[PDB]
JSON list of C-alpha atoms and ligand atoms in Angstrom, two decimals:
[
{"chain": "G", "resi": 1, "resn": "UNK", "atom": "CA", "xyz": [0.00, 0.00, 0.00]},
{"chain": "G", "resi": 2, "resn": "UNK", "atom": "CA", "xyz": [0.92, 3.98, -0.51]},
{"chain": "G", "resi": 3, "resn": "UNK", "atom": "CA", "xyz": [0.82, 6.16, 1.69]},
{"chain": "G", "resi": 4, "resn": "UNK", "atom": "CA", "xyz": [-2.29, 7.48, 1.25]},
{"chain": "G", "resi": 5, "resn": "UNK", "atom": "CA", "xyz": [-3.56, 3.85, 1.30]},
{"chain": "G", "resi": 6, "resn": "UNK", "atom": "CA", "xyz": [-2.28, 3.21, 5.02]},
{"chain": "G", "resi": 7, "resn": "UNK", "atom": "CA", "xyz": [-3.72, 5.98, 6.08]},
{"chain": "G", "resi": 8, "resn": "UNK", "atom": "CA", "xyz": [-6.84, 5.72, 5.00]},
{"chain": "G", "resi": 9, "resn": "UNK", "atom": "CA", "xyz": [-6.90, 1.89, 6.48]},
{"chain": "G", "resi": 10, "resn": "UNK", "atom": "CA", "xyz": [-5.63, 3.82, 9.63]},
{"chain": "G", "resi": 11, "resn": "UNK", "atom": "CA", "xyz": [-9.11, 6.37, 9.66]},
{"chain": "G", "resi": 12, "resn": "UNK", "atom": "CA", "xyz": [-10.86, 2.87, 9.45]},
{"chain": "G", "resi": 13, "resn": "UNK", "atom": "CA", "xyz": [-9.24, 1.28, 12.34]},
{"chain": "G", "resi": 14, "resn": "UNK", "atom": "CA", "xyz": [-9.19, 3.93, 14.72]},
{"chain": "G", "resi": 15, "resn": "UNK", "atom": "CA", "xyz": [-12.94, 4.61, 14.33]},
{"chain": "G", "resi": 16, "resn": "UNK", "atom": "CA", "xyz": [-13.66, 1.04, 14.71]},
{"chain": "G", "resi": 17, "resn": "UNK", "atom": "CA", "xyz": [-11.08, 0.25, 18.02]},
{"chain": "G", "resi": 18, "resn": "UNK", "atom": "CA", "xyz": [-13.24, 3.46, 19.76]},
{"chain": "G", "resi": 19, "resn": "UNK", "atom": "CA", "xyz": [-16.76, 2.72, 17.96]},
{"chain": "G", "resi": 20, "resn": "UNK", "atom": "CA", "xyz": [-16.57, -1.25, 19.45]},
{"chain": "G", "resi": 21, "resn": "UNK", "atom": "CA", "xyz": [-16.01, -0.26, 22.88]},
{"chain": "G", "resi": 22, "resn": "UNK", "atom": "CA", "xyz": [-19.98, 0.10, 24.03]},
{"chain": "G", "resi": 23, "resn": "UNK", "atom": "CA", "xyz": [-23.11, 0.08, 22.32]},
{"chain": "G", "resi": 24, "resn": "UNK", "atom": "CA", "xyz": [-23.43, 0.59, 18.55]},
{"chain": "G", "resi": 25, "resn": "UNK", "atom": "CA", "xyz": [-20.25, -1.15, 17.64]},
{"chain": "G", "resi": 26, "resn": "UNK", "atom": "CA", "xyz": [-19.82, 1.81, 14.23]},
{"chain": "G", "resi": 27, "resn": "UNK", "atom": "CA", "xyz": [-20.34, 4.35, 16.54]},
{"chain": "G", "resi": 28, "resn": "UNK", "atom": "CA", "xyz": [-18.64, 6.78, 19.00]},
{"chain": "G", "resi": 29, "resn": "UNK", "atom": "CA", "xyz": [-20.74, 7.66, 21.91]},
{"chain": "G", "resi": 30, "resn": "UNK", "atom": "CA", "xyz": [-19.88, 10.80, 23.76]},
{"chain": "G", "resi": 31, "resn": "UNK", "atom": "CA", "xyz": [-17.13, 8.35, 26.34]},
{"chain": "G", "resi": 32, "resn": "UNK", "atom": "CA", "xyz": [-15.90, 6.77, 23.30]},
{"chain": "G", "resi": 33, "resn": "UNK", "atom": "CA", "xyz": [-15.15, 10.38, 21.39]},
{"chain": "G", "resi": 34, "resn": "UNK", "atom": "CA", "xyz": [-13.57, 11.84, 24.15]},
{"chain": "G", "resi": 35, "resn": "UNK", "atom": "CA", "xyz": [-10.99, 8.73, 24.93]},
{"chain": "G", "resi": 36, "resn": "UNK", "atom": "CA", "xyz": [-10.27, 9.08, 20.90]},
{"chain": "G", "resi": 37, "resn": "UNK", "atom": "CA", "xyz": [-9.45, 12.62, 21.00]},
{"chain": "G", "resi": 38, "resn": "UNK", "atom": "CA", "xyz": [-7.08, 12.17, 24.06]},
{"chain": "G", "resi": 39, "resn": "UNK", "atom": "CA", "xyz": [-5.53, 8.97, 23.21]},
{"chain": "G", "resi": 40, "resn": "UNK", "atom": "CA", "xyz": [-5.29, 9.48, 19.68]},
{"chain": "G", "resi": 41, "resn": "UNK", "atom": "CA", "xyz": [-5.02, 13.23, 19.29]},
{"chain": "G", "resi": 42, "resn": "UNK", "atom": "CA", "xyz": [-3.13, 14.22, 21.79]},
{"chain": "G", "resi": 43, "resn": "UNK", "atom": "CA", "xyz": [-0.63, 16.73, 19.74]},
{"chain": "G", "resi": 44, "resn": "UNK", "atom": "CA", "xyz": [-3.38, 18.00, 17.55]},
{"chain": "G", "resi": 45, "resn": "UNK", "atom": "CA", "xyz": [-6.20, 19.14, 20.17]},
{"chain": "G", "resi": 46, "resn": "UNK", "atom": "CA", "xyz": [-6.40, 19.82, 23.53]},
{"chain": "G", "resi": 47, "resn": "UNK", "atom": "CA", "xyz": [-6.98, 17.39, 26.19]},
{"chain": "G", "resi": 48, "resn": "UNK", "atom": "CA", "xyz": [-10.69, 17.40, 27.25]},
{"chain": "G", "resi": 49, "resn": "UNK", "atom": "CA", "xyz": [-11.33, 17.09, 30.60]},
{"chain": "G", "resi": 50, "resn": "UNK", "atom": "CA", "xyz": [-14.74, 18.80, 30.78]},
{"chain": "G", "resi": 51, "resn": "UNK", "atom": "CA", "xyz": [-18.01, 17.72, 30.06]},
{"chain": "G", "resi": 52, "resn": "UNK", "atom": "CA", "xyz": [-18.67, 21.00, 28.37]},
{"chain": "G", "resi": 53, "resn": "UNK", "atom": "CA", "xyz": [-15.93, 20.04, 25.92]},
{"chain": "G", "resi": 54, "resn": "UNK", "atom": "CA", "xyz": [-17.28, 16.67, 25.04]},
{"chain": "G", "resi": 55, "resn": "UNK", "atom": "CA", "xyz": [-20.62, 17.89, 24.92]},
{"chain": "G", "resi": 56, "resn": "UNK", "atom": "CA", "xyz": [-19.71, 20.38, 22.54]},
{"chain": "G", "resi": 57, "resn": "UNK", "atom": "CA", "xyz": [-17.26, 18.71, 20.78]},
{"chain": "G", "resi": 58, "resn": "UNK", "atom": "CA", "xyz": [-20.34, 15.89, 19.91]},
{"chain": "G", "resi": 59, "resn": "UNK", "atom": "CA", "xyz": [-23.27, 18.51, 19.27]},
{"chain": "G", "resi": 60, "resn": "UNK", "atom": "CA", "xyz": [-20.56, 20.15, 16.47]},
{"chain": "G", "resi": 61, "resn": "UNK", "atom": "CA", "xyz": [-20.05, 16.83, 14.42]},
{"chain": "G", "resi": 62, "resn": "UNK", "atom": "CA", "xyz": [-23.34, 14.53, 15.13]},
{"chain": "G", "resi": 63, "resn": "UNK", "atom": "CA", "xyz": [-25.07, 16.30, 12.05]},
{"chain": "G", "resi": 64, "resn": "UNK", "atom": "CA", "xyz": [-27.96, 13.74, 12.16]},
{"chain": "G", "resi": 65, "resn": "UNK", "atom": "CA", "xyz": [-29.05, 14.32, 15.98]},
{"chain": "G", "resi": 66, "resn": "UNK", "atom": "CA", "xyz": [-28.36, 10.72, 17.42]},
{"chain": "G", "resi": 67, "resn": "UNK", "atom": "CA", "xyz": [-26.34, 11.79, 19.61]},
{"chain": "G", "resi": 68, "resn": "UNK", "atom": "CA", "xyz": [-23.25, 9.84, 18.45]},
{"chain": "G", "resi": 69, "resn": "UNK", "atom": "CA", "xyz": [-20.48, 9.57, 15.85]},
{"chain": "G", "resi": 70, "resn": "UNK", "atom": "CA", "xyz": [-21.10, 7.80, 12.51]},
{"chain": "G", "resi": 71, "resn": "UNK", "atom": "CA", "xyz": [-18.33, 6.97, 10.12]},
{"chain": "G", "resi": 72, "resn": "UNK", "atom": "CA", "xyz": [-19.75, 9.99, 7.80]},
{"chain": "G", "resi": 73, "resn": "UNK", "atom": "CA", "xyz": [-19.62, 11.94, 10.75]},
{"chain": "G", "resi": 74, "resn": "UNK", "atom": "CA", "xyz": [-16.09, 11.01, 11.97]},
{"chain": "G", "resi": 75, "resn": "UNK", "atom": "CA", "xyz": [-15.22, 11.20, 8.74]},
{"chain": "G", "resi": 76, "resn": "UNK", "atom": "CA", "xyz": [-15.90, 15.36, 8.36]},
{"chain": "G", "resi": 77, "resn": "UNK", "atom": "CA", "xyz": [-14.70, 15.59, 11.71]},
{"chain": "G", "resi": 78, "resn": "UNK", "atom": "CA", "xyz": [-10.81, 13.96, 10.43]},
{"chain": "G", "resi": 79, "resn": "UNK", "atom": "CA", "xyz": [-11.59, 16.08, 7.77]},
{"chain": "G", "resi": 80, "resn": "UNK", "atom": "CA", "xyz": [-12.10, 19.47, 10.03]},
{"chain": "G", "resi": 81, "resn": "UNK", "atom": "CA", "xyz": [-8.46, 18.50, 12.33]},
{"chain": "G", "resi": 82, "resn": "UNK", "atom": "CA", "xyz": [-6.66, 17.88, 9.10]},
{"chain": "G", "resi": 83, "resn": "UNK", "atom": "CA", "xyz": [-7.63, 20.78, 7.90]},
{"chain": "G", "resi": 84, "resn": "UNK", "atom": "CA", "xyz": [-6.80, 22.85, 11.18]},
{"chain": "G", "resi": 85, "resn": "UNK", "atom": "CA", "xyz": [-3.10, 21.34, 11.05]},
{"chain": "G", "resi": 86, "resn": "UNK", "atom": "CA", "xyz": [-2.65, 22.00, 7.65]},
{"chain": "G", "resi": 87, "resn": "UNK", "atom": "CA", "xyz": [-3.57, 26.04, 8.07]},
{"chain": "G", "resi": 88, "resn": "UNK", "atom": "CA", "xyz": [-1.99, 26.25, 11.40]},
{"chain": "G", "resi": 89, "resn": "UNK", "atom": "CA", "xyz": [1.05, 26.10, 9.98]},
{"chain": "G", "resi": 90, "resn": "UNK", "atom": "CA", "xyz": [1.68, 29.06, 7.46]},
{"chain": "G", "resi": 91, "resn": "UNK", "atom": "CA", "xyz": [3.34, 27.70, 3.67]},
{"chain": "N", "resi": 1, "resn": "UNK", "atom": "CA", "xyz": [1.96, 10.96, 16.78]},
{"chain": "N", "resi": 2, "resn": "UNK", "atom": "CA", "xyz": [-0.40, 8.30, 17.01]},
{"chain": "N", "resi": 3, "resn": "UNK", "atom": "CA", "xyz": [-1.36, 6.12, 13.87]},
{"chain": "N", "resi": 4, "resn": "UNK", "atom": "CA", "xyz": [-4.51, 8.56, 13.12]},
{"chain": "N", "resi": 5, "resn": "UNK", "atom": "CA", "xyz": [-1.93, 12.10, 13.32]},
{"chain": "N", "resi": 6, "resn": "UNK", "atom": "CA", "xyz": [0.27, 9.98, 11.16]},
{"chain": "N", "resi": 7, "resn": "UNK", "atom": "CA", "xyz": [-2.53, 9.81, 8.59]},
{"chain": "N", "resi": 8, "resn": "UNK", "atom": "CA", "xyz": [-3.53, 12.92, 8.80]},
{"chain": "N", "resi": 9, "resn": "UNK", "atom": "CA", "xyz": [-0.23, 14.00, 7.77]},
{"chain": "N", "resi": 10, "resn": "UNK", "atom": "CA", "xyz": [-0.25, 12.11, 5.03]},
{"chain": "N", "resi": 11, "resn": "UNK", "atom": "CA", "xyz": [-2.98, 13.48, 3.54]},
{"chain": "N", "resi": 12, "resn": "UNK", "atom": "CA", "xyz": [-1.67, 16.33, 3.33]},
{"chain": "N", "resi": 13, "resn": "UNK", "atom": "CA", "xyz": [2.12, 15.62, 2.47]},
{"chain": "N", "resi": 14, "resn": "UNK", "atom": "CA", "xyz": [0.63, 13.45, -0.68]},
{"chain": "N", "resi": 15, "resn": "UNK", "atom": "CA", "xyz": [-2.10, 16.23, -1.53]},
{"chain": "N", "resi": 16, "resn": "UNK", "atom": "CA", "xyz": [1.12, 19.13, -1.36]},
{"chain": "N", "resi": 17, "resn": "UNK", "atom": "CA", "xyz": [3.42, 16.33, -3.68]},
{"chain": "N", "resi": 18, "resn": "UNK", "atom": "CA", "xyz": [0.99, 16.35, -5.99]},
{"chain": "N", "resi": 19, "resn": "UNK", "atom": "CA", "xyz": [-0.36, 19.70, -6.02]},
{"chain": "N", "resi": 20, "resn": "UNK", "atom": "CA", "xyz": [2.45, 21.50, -6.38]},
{"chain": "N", "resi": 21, "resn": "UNK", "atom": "CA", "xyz": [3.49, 20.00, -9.57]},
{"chain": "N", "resi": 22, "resn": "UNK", "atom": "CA", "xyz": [1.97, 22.51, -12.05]},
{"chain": "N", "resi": 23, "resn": "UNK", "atom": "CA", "xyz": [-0.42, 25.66, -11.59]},
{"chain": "N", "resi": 24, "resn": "UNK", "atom": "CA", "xyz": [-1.49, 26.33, -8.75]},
{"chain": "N", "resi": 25, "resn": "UNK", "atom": "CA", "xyz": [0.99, 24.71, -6.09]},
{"chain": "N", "resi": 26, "resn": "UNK", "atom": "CA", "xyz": [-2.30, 24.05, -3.90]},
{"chain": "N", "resi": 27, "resn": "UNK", "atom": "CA", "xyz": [-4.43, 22.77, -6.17]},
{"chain": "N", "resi": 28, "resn": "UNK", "atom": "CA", "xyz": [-4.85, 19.37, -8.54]},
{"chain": "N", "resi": 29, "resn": "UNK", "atom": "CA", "xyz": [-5.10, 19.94, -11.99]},
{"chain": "N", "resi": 30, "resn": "UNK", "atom": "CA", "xyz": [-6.45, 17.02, -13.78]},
{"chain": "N", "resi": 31, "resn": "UNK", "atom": "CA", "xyz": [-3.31, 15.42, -14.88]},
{"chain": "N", "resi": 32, "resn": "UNK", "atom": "CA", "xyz": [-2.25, 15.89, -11.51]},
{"chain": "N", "resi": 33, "resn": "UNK", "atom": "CA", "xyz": [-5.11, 14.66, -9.97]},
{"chain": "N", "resi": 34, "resn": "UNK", "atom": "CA", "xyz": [-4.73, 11.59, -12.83]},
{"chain": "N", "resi": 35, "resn": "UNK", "atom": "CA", "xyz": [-1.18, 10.66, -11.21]},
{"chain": "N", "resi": 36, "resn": "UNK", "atom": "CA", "xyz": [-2.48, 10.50, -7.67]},
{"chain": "N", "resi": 37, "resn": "UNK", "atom": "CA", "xyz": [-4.86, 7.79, -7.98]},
{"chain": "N", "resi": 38, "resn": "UNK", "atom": "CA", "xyz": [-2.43, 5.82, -10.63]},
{"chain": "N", "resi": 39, "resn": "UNK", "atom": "CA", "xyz": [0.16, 5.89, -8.14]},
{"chain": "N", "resi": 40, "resn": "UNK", "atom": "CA", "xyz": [-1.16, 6.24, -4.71]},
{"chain": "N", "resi": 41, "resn": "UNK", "atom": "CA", "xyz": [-4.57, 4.65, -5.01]},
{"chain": "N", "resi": 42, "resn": "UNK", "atom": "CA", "xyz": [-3.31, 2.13, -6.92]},
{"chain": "N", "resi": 43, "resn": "UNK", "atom": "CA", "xyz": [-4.97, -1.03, -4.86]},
{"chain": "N", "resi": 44, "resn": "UNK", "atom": "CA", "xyz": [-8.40, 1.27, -4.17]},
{"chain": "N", "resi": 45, "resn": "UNK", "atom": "CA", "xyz": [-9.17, 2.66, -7.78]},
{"chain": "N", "resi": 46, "resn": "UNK", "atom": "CA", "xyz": [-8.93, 1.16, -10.40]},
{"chain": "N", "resi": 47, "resn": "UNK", "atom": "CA", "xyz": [-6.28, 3.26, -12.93]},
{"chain": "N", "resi": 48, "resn": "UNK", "atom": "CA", "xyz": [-7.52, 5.48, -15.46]},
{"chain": "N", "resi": 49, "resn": "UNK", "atom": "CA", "xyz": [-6.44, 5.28, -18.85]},
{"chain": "N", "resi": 50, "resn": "UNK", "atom": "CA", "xyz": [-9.28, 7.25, -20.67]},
{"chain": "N", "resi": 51, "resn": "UNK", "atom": "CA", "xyz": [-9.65, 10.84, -20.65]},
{"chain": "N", "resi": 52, "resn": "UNK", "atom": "CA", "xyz": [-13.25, 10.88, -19.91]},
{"chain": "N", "resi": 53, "resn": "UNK", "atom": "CA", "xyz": [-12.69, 8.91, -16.56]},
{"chain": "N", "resi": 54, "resn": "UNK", "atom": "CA", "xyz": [-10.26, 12.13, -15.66]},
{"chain": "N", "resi": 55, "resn": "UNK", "atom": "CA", "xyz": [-12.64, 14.47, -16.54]},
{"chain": "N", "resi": 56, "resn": "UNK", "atom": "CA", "xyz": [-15.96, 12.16, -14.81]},
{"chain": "N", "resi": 57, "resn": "UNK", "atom": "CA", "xyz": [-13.39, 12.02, -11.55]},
{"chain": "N", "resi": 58, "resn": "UNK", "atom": "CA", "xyz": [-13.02, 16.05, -11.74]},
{"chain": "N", "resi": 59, "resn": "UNK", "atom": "CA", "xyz": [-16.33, 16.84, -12.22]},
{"chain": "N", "resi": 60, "resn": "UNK", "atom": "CA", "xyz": [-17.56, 14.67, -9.76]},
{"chain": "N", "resi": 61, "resn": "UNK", "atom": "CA", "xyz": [-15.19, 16.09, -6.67]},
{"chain": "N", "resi": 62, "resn": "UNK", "atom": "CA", "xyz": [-14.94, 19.98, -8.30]},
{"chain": "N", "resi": 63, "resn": "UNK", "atom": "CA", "xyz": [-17.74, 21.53, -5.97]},
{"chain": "N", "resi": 64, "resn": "UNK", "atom": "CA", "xyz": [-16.12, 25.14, -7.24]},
{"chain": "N", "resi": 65, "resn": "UNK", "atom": "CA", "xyz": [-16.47, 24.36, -11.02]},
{"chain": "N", "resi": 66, "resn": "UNK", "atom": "CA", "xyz": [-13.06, 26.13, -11.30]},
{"chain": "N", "resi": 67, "resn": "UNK", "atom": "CA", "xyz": [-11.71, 22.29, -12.86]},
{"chain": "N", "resi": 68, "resn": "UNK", "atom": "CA", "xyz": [-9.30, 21.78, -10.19]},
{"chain": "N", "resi": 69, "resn": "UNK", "atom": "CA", "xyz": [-9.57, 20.16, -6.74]},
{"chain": "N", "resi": 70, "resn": "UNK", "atom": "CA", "xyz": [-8.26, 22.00, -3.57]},
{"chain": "N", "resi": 71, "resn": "UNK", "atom": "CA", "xyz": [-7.54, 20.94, 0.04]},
{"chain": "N", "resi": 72, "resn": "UNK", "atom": "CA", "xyz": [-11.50, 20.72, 1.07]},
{"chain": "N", "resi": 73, "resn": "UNK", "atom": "CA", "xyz": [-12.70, 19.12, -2.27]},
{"chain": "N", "resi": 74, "resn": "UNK", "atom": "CA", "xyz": [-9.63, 16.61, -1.73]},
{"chain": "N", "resi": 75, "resn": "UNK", "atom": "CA", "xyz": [-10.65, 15.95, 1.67]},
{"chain": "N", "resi": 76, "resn": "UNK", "atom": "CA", "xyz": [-13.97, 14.99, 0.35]},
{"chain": "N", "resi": 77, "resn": "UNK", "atom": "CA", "xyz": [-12.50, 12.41, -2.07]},
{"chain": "N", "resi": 78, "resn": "UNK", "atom": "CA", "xyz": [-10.10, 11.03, 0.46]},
{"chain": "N", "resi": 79, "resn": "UNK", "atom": "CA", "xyz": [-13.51, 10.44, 2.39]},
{"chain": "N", "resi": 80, "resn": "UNK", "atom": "CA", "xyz": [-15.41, 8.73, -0.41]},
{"chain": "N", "resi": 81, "resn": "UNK", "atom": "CA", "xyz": [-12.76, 6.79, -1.36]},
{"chain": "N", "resi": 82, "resn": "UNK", "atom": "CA", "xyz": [-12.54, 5.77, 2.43]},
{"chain": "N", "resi": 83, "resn": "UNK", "atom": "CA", "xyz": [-16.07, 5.11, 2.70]},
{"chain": "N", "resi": 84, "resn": "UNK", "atom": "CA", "xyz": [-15.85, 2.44, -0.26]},
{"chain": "N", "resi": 85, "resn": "UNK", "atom": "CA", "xyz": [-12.97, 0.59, 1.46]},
{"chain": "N", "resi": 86, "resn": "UNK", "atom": "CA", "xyz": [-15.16, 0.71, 4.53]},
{"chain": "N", "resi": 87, "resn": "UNK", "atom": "CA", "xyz": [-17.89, -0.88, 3.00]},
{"chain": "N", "resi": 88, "resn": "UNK", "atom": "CA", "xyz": [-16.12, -2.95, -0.11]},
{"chain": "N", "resi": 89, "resn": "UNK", "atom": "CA", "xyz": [-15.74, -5.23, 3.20]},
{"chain": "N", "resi": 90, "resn": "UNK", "atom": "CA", "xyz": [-18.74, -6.88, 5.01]},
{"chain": "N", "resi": 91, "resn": "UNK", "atom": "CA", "xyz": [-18.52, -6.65, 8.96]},
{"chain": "M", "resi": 101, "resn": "LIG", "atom": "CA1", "xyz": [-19.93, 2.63, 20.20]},
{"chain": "M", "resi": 102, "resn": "LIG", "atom": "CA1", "xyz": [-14.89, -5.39, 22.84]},
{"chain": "M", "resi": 103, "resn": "LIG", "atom": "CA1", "xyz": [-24.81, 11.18, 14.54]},
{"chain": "M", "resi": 104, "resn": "LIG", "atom": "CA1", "xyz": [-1.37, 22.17, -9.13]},
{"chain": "M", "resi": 105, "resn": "LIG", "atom": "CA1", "xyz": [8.40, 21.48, -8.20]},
{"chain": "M", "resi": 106, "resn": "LIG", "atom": "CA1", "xyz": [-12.55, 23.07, -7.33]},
{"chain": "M", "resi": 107, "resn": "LIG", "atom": "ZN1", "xyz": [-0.67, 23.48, 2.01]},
{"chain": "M", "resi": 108, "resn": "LIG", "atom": "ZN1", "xyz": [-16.92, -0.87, 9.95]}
]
């Protein structure tokens, strides 16, 4: 595989390791989120350590109102980070 | 980094190889655009060899209409392509 390959298998498997923790196995509930963003983030967001946070964090990318994270969903929110790193750094 | 910051860089590092080739360094022409799938979505897609799959690929992912993908619309095809990994696989 490129490059771009492995990473792409790499969006997969990361959003199915935190989806199959609880409930809907291809879904991130608000516990399962958070643990992703500070496990797997850690250099590219800010720890959360508030409810507030999570909360927010999940109303911003849960565009269908089930409260959790679908692949879609995770899916514009890798897109939304990416995007952040790749203007926070001026080129 | 973790495995999903690792990807995330690598969109972008393979989106700024093959943008900058010609034109605008931060955008895919088509026959840059053409390249990236031959040669780094080489196991996902299969490789064009026609003209009118380049231009059906543009139009498709060129939400502008300016006939060249940027950063967002590129994001967008890294997610479709994703998406059709994810579910090329039952599970
Ligand atoms: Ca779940
Ligand atoms: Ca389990
Ligand atoms: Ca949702
Ligand atoms: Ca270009
Ligand atoms: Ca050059
Ligand atoms: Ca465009
Ligand atoms: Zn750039
Ligand atoms: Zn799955």
């Amino acid at each position: 595989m490129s490059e771009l390959e492995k990473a792409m298998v790499a969006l997969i498997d990361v959003f199915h390791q935190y989806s199959g923790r609880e409930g809907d196995k291809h879904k991130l509930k608000k516990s399962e989120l958070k643990e992703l963003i500070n496990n797997e983030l850690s250099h590219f967001l800010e720890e959360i350590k508030e409810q507030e946070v999570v909360d927010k964090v999940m109303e911003t990318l849960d565009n269908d109102g089930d409260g959790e994270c679908d692949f879609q969903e995770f899916m514009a929110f890798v897109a939304m980070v990416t995007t952040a790193c790749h203007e926070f750094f001026e080129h």
